[PDB]
Design a binder for this molecule. Structure first.
Ligand SMILES: Oc1ccccc1-c1cc2c(nn1)NC[C@@H]1CNCCN21
Ligand SMILES: Oc1ccccc1-c1cc2c(nn1)NC[C@@H]1CNCCN21
Ligand SMILES: [Zn+2]
Ligand SMILES: [Zn+2]
Ligand SMILES: [Zn+2]
Lengths: 115, 115, 115
């Protein structure tokens, strides 16, 4: 469980980059509303219903500071992001929809760079 | 007797760049599964009944490393893939349809590219 | 009312150099064609159509001659570059698409250093 190689760090990023920077057919960068969560004092409901919240920043941070040991351990936090999103949003609502798409992007992006 | 110049580089790239990025009515890029083959370990059965397999990766290799003389060289690789993808996968099975869908997309991209 | 600290000037160049330096997934420097405008004699067109023409050399030249006052003054010009590309070049035409990409990189460079 000793120094996170640079090679592994080099992946996590580009993966989470591939994701963040993804722009759809119309060209809308889907990540926009996932980067920063909204405030407890803005959307208290979210933090009532979502027991273990998360956004992208807080995933990037955890990359930056070598918390994540394997690519597995990242997927989980990206997956929990979308789970959360889906859980809070109305099926067929643009928020709800993006999370899915992104979910896939990662899995292909991770595939395309990982084992 | 001679080299492979800008027209053969740009155009043969231009063609392929286009095809890859082609997305159906659902904006679903159909190149997806045709970029990187399954490993021989992954799906032995492919190679247990396909003579001379080929990826998408290898196409851009054959481009970057100047093996395709004319257009007629490229297409042969291109159409083959589909031939395989069709040969292997089942009629109606998404991949099959995609594989065909592609064939043509190239055909237009080649014909449209009139010098 | 006062000249530009080297702290600033060295940003303008970092930000712009990130931009210019940038290559796409493929490994393709998008900047390439924007670095220098075409000759008047070569694209008389561009000059008839584009009101205030600008490429990258001149921006550099305009950082060097302490001609940009804020980062605004810069981005203002940097976007004038992409507007002009998208004004002249047809939607979906490779160039066009690229220009948009760059607009983002620039903004992600700048939004990076504003922190
Ligand atoms: O589920 C998330 C995970 C990570 C980051 C953000 C969200 C998120 C943001 C949301 C929302 N739901 N989820 N509902 C509507 C609300 C409208 N205003 C923008 C903020 N937004
Ligand atoms: O819009 C621009 C902004 C800054 C620098 C260059 C351009 C630019 C270059 C162009 C073009 N359109 N725009 N049309 C295609 C043509 C292909 N041959 C070289 C010239 N090139
Ligand atoms: Zn570190
Ligand atoms: Zn070469
Ligand atoms: Zn000076």
């Amino acid at each position: 469980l000793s120094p996170n190689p640079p090679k592994l760090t080099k992946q996590m990023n580009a993966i989470i980059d591939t994701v963040i920077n993804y722009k759809d057919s119309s060209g809308r960068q889907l990540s926009e509303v996932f980067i920063q969560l909204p405030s407890r004092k803005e959307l208290p409901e979210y933090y009532e219903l979502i027991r273990k919240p998360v956004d992208f920043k807080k995933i990037k941070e955890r990359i930056r500071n070598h918390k994540y040991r394997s690519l597995g351990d990242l997927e989980k936090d990206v997956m929990l992001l979308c789970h959360n999103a889906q859980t809070f949003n109305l099926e067929g609502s643009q928020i709800y929809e993006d999370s899915i798409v992104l979910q896939s992007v990662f899995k292909s992006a991770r595939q395309k760079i990982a084992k």
